[PDB]
Design a protein around this ligand. Structure first.
Ligand SMILES: CC(C)Cc1ccc([C@H](C)C(=O)O)cc1
Ligand SMILES: CC(C)Cc1ccc([C@H](C)C(=O)O)cc1
Length: 580
């Protein structure tokens, strides 16, 4: 009778208020905090009134109608929000669709550095306002962030300040925890953005396929019936969250966490720990649960999927069912494979049956289908071994430098900051994944690589520069990494004009901390390649080494600007000759 009442009743006031604040911060990214807080408190008051009397006026209206009418009491300021003003002239569901279309992925808001003493004071004074500010600041920076997971991370944010504010040194207690939390926010955002990107670009079938593969790996003891059930429910949850239906999303996610935990005997023996936790922690634990042990009764796939003489009939009868079954069975027994590799294998299997069932003698044609998977498996295995061998030899910094050179040579039209960011990001993937057991390296590496490539594709949608990038981004999720791997330096690329100022360092760099110094030098590295794209890796390594030594010498000098002023121009001049 009243949707807002039902969601308020199911979620409770605190979670309701949290999710409405996040939704508003994601939809309305540029507006300040107190404006959002008022609209949350006003909407929650309305929810309470409706919960008391569901047959009252305006309580029967849709969440989009109510919340949209609420957003449009401040979104009409065209100066602060351009298009959102236009969206507010539309009725539903056109208005909601208009809001979704104009969500900014790279809003480019000031990066927030913690003020430990100022923050600890504000936490103790008004904890609700402080934690509200966190949800708000993260939400508008990450407009497709998984709503209920942001509440979970907000409780971790609370747990940090709670533990450290009462201590004698607040600053050095917090920094490691908030730096750690920031990493988790980045990974989590990337994970959810791929799901929304998959809905947006490829549709439901792609999302379900992806989930079937991942959950089959996670829950090998579970039968095909159980994974299909969980995938169907999980796809509806993520479909709701990606389409801005956060109260609906959160409620259905809680229902799924409940079901998994009530039926964990027929899902996984790894869920016992997860299922003794409060709502947000329980859902999070399940989402991140490690893969179960392989069952002893895994079947022979070759007999069922290559040798059976009437496979073409079974395929025609129900294609997605038969393919889903193959993906389920193949995924279960290959926990050491990446999800994109499993989907590529499934796609190859489908392609073989599509070709072979249109031929004279089908069984002879698809007899060797499993041998087509061998080259698909060896490709990523070789890449991870090559990258991990290099990482373990040269370490994170020089590994990042190798990737910045590799990637600038492939796509020199891409912006220096973006090229540096992808090189640095994938550099850290190496450090995290190459230390793991050999069997966990390939999933870790290629699953994280998929998140990095999707981030790049989402940035490229906003700011297109390269026709090659568009090609790799708009083709299938399975073929994405192969397409990016296959990218090579344009035969008719015009080297970026030399600009001495680009490679000129000043004493300002001595201010910056280590990571920021690295980014300045790694930016110069990208620029070196854009001007000299045929320059060898060792040439570029030597020139960067000379720039590093120069920066170290002049930052350690009694008169820093005199050193930079004298030595800088010499190195800029000689560097051109070294990269011919
Ligand atoms: C702590 C977090 C998990 C839930 C939560 C819910 C609502 C609010 C609002 C903004 C408020 O209390 O003012 C903050 C935090
Ligand atoms: C912009 C572009 C160069 C990004 C890009 C392209 C290819 C790869 C593959 C997986 C590799 O590491 O060789 C990663 C990132």
């Amino acid at each position: 009778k009243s949707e807002i009442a039902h969601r308020f009743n199911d979620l409770g006031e605190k979670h309701f208020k949290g999710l409405v604040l996040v939704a508003f911060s994601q939809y309305l990214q540029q507006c300040p905090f107190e404006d959002h807080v008022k609209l949350v408190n006003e909407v929650t008051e309305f929810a309470k009134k409706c919960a008391a009397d569901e047959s009252a006026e305006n309580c029967d209206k849709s969440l989009h109608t109510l919340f949209g009418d609420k957003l449009c009491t401040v979104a009409t300021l065209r100066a602060t929000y351009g298009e959102l003003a236009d969206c507010c002239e539309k009725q539903e569901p056109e208005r909601n669709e208009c809001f979704l279309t104009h969500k900014d992925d790279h809003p480019n808001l000031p990066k927030l550095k913690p003020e430990p003493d100022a923050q600890c004071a504000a936490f103790q004074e008004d904890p609700d306002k402080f934690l509200g500010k966190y949800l708000y600041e993260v939400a508008r920076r990450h407009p497709y962030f998984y709503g209920p997971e942001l509440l979970f991370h907000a409780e971790e944010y609370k747990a940090d300040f709670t533990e450290c504010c009462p201590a004698d040194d607040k600053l050095a207690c917090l920094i490691p925890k908030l730096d750690a939390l920031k990493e988790r926010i980045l990974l989590s955002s990337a994970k959810e953005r791929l799901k929304c990107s998959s809905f947006q670009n490829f549709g439901e079938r792609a999302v379900k396929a992806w989930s079937v593969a991942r959950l089959s790996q996670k829950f090998p003891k579970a039968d095909f019936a159980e994974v299909s059930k969980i995938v169907t429910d999980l796809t509806k949850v993520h479909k709701e969250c990606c389409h801005g239906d956060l109260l609906e999303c959160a409620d259905d996610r809680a229902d799924l966490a409940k079901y998994i935990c009530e039926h964990q005997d027929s899902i996984s023996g790894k869920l016992k720990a997860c299922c003794d936790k409060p709502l947000l922690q329980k859902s999070h634990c399940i989402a991140e649960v490690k893969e179960d042990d392989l069952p002893s009764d895994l079947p022979a796939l070759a007999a069922d999927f290559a040798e059976d003489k009437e496979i073409c009939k079974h395929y025609k009868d129900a294609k997605d069912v038969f393919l889903g079954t193959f993906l389920y069975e193949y995924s279960r027994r290959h926990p050491d494979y990446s999800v994109s590799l499993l989907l590529r294998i499934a796609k190859t299997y489908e392609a073989t049956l599509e070709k072979c069932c249109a031929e004279a003698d089908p069984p002879a044609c698809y007899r060797t289908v499993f041998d087509q998977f061998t080259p698909l498996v060896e490709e990523p295995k070789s890449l991870v071994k090559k990258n991990c061998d290099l990482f373990e030899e040269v370490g994170e910094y020089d590994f990042q430098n190798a990737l910045i050179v590799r990637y600038t040579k492939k796509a020199p039209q891409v912006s220096t900051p973006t090229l540096v960011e992808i090189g640095r990001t994938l550099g850290k993937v190496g450090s995290r994944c190459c230390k793991l057991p050999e069997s966990e390296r390939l999933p870790c590496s290629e699953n994280h690589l998929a998140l990095a490539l999707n981030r790049l594709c989402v940035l490229h949608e906003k700011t297109p520069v390269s026709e090659k990038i568009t090609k790799c981004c708009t083709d299938s999720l399975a073929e994405r990494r192969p397409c990016f791997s296959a990218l090579e330096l344009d035969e008719g690329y015009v080297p970026k004009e030399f600009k001495a100022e680009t490679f000129t360092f000043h004493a300002d760099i001595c201010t910056l901390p280590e990571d920021e110094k690295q980014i300045k030098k790694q930016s110069a590295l990208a620029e070196l390649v854009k001007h000299k794209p045929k320059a060898t890796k060792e040439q570029l390594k030597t020139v960067l080494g000379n720039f590093s030594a120069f920066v170290a010498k002049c930052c350690g000098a009694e008169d820093k600007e005199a050193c930079f002023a004298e030595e800088g121009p010499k190195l800029v001049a000689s560097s051109q000759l070294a990269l011919a």
